[PDB]
């Protein structure tokens, strides 16, 4: 069983937003006891909804939990900037809970900010070690949600890159991100073009930063 949610949603203060949560087995039923938990910076967790409709004691009235069609749903009526967080949904499958991937809710604190993309090839000093790392940098973007894809000779890569993000800036709401792709010195030298494709709210078309080894 797989529990799925929207990867990220954007709204502005005062609007009404609805998050969904999907059972891989079919329609979410009350037997699933849908729960909604919120994650704020520095890993702060708040239970909002339990057993599909019930508000956890103390949760504001603008949070509502419901069943809509085949999915469980969390509705924020009058979204606040303090509601910008990651919302997790858990479904009860007979004897255990299964959380979903999470939904990054962005409640617009400012104008959309595009990132500036920079690519760094591996140092020769590292190449003497026998490993190669390509570093991709995204500077001062908002919202957080962005897709950084590594393309080695136009081939999409997977399982060989790890990401890191800075804390949200207290003065202009921007984020910075680091994408590092590590390979064998052997596997590095068996390819040509290393590219970093970046899709974001602020970019009409995806930005690509590329370099050729050799």
């Amino acid at each position: 069983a797989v529990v799925t949610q929207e990867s990220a949603l954007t709204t502005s203060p005062g609007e009404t937003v609805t998050l969904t949560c999907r059972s891989s087995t079919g329609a979410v039923i009350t037997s699933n006891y849908a729960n909604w938990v919120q994650e704020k910076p520095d890993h702060l967790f708040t239970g909002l909804i339990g057993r599909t409709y019930n508000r956890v004691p103390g949760v504001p009235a603008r949070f509502s939990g419901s069943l809509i069609g085949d999915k469980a749903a969390l509705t924020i009526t009058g979204a606040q900037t303090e509601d910008e967080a990651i919302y997790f949904c858990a479904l009860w499958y007979s004897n255990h809970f299964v959380f979903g991937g999470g939904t990054k809710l962005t409640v617009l604190k400012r104008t959309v900010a595009a990132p500036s993309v920079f690519i760094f090839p591996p140092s020769d000093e590292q190449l003497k070690s026998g490993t190669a790392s390509v570093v991709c940098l995204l500077n001062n973007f908002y919202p957080r949600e962005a897709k950084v894809q590594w393309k080695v000779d136009n081939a999409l890569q997977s399982g060989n890159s790890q990401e890191s993000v800075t804390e949200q800036d207290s003065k202009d709401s921007t984020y910075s991100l680091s994408s590092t792709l590590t390979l064998s010195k052997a596997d590095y030298e068996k390819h040509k073009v290393y590219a970093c494709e970046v899709t974001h709210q602020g970019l009409s078309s995806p930005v690509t930063k590329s370099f050729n080894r050799g």
Binding site: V37, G50, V56, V98, F99, I119
Partner: protein, 217 residues
């Protein structure tokens, strides 16, 4: 009187080792709530590990985690325990003591568990040299890659503290090695680059390794 889920007892364990996390609950009737353990790792989301009933007479697990985690509670002492045995490298996460009743109302502060077989190693610092793949127009990005060190605490400064505007030190990530790697970068005007000299100063005090590396184009 505030609801306090105080966790403790997390740190370094080797792969295949054991560990017991404590969470002492005060401010609520610990006897009256179901108690659950849930973990969060950087690449994953929230993973519900398991729950124990108020009376301890039923323990529910997710099937893939049944064998390596053991949940117990003591209503007399108002504490909940999680025992981790034969732990994998993938088990590195922040483990969270969470109450369940209507929902997941009360949470703990978080306990870090790092599973790694490495001993104390100093980092290697490789320059992130600027180029026109690292220039956009007017401003240029450069930095330092601090790679394969253990344990976590590492400090990075630029030109011994002279440069602080626009520097970004990203959180370190735990590699499959069991070693940490981290990247620090700065954005400066590209005019500057010809005149100014740029050095990142990295200090790893568990190894007593201090490296001053310059990033030259």
């Amino acid at each position: 009187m505030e609801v306090k889920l105080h966790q403790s007892g997390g740190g370094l364990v080797q792969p295949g080792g054991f560990l017991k996390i404590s969470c002492v609950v005060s401010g609520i009737d610990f006897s009256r709530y179901w108690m659950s353990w849930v973990r969060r790792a950087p690449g994953k989301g929230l993973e519900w590990i398991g729950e124990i009933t108020p009376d301890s007479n039923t323990i529910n697990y997710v099937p893939s985690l049944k064998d390596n985690f053991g949940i117990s509670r003591d209503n007399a002492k108002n504490t909940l325990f999680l025992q981790m045995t034969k732990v994998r490298s993938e088990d590195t996460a922040l483990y969270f003591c969470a109450s369940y009743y209507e929902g997941f109302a009360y949470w703990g502060q978080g306990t870090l568990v790092t599973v790694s077989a490495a001993s104390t190693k100093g980092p290697s610092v490789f320059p992130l040299a600027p180029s026109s793949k690292s220039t956009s127009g007017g401003t240029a990005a450069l930095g330092c890659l601090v790679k394969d060190y253990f344990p976590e605490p590492v400090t990075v400064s630029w030109n011994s503290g002279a440069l602080t505007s626009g520097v970004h030190t990203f959180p370190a990530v735990l590699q499959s090695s069991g070693l940490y790697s981290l990247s620090s970068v700065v954005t400066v005007p590209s005019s500057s680059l010809g005149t100014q000299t740029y050095i990142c100063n990295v200090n790893h005090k568990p190894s007593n390794t201090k490296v001053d590396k310059k990033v030259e184009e």
